[PDB]
């Protein structure tokens, strides 16, 4: 806990964008820490057939163009959610477009879907997908592929379509990002009427299943190779800033469509007075410790309103396996981190896994599967 939070004397900051860049340069070229503990068999979760050997995982903010997803994942994580990968490459907003709020343990940011392109990112999944089995054959590093629209396409439904065409076959779970505050009216695609039109279109390009056998796990890599027969569990990442009315419209359209899961909360555009740090007034959604009750309620509301029959991967201020314990108790099968690592640091994957496992030991039940949603047994 006390690494960077104790040692934050140096002025405003060492720039977050710059830091993340030279961090990911390290991530790209090995040059990182390493988890060794193998993770207790307690912490494994079979979210709809998907074996999450650990339920802790890196969120979609980090490895934005598949620079090093397995290397973050060998560094203690269970899964790694890969960017928001827009069809055509985007530059993003003008920098400085991202800020630490040291006091508040938070990060406001307005990057705006800065992507390399499915042109660039497909090859890198073509890379990862075939060598991920090879390198050290990990109890496969479960792999999230998150996709969106470009700044100004008329039909996002097309850019999700393209997305699912290209980079679907590698994802253990695919993710439609409809939530970022930092793309023009994208969040307003979460509507009952649109959400459906997208979700159906998106599982319609999954309905492109192609044929084979017609001219150790050495070679599971062949075919469309997602630790199984391809089909990613379809997800949609939803907002934190929503009416009970709009969380119905979602939850209804979730159970209507047979959506395989929901990722609970992107960043929040709320600014709760309590934020003391003088960067509180910058635009963009804020992550981290202010997004605690926000996210954790959003898990619980979407759990119950989906009868729990839809899966939940909650992000939003998951700092310590206690926060993970509660979000697991509120509905989450697995949980995500990003802004919690910018204060904890690389070996926070190993920390949150074990903080969770001991608070399971203390709570009584071990093996999380029993644990999920526990809050909805009265
Ligand atoms: C700089 C930054 C970039 C992000 N980029 C993305 C993104 O490209 N796609 C996405 O789905 N979420 C993105 N997020 C949201 C995170 O994935 C996550 O949902 C949010 O930060 C809450 O998690 P945390 O409080 O546990 O860090 C980003 C967050 C930050 C702070
Ligand atoms: C300065 C440099 C070239 C590398 C620093 C990384 C390192 C070895 C240790 C941690 C030092 C540090 C202050 C990191 C800050 C950091 C961020 O502020 C940050 C902000 C947003 C997204 C990702 C980020 O990753 C970071 O490592
Ligand atoms: O690209 C961004 O600016 C961005 C994407 C996202 O999903 N969430 C966020 O807070 N910012």
From TrEMBL:
SUPFAM superfamilies, A to Z: FMN-linked oxidoreductases
Catalysed reaction, written as an equation: (S)-dihydroorotate + a quinone = orotate + a quinol
GO terms under biological process: 'de novo' pyrimidine nucleobase biosynthetic process; 'de novo' UMP biosynthetic process
Entry-linked PROSITE patterns: DHODEHASE_1, DHODEHASE_2
Disulphides: 73-141
Domain (Dihydroorotate dehydrogenase catalytic) ranges: 43-360
Binding site for orotate: 64, 109, 111-113, 177, 180, 182, 266-267
Pfam families per UniProt: DHO_dh (PF01180)
Entry's Gene Ontology cellular component terms: mitochondrial inner membrane
Cofactor note: Binds 1 FMN per subunit.
Binding site for FMN: 60, 64, 84, 146, 237, 266, 287-288, 315-318, 338-339
Topology relative to the membrane: Single-pass membrane protein
Family statement: Belongs to the dihydroorotate dehydrogenase family. Type 2 subfamily.
PANTHER family: DIHYDROOROTATE DEHYDROGENASE (QUINONE), MITOCHONDRIAL (PTHR48109:SF4), DIHYDROOROTATE DEHYDROGENASE (QUINONE), MITOCHONDRIAL-RELATED (PTHR48109)
Name the UniProt record assigns to this protein: Dihydroorotate dehydrogenase (quinone), mitochondrial
Organism (species): Eimeria tenella
């Amino acid at each position: 806990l006390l690494e960077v939070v104790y040692g934050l004397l140096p002025e405003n900051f060492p720039d977050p964008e710059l830091a993340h860049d030279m961090v990911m340069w390290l991530a790209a070229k090995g040059y990182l820490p390493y988890d060794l503990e193998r993770d207790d068999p307690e912490l494994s979760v079979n979210i709809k057939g998907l074996t999450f050997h650990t339920p802790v995982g890196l969120a979609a903010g980090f490895d934005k163009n598949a620079e090093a997803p397995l290397n973050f994942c060998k560094m203690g994580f269970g899964f790694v959610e890969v960017g928001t990968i827009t069809p055509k490459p985007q530059l993003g907003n003008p920098k400085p477009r991202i800020f630490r709020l040291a006091k508040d343990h938070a990060i406001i940011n307005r990057c705006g879907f800065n992507s390399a392109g499915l042109d660039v990112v497909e090859p890198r999944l073509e890379k990862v997908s075939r060598d991920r089995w090879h390198d050290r054959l990990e109890r496969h590093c479960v792999l999230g592929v998150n996709i969106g629209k470009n700044k100004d396409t008329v039909n996002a439904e097309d850019d999700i379509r393209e997305g699912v065409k290209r980079v679907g076959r590698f994802a253990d779970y695919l993710v439609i990002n409809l939530s970022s505050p930092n793309t023009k009216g994208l969040r307003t695609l979460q509507q009952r009427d649109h959400l459906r039109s997208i979700i159906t279109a998106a599982q319609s390009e999954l309905e492109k299943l192609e044929e084979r056998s017609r001219a150790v796990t050495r070679k599971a890599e062949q075919f469309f190779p997602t630790q199984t027969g391809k089909r990613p569990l379809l997800f949609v990442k939803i907002a934190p800033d929503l009416t009970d009315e709009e969380k119905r419209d979602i939850a209804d359209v979730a159970l209507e469509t047979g959506l395989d899961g929901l990722i609970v909360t992107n960043t929040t555009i709320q600014r709760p007075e309590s934020l003391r740090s003088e960067s509180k007034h910058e635009t963009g959604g804020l992550s981290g410790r202010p997004l605690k009750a926000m996210s954790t309620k959003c898990v619980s509301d979407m759990y119950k309103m989906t009868n729990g029959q839809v899966a939940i991967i909650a992000s939003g201020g998951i700092e310590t396996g206690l926060d993970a314990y509660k979000r697991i108790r509120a509905g989450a099968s697995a949980v995500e981190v990003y802004t919690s690592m910018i204060y904890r640091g690389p070996i926070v994957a190993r920390r949150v896994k074990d903080e969770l496992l001991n608070i399971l030991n203390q709570a009584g039940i071990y093996n999380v599967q029993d644990a999920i949603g526990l809050d909805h047994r009265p």
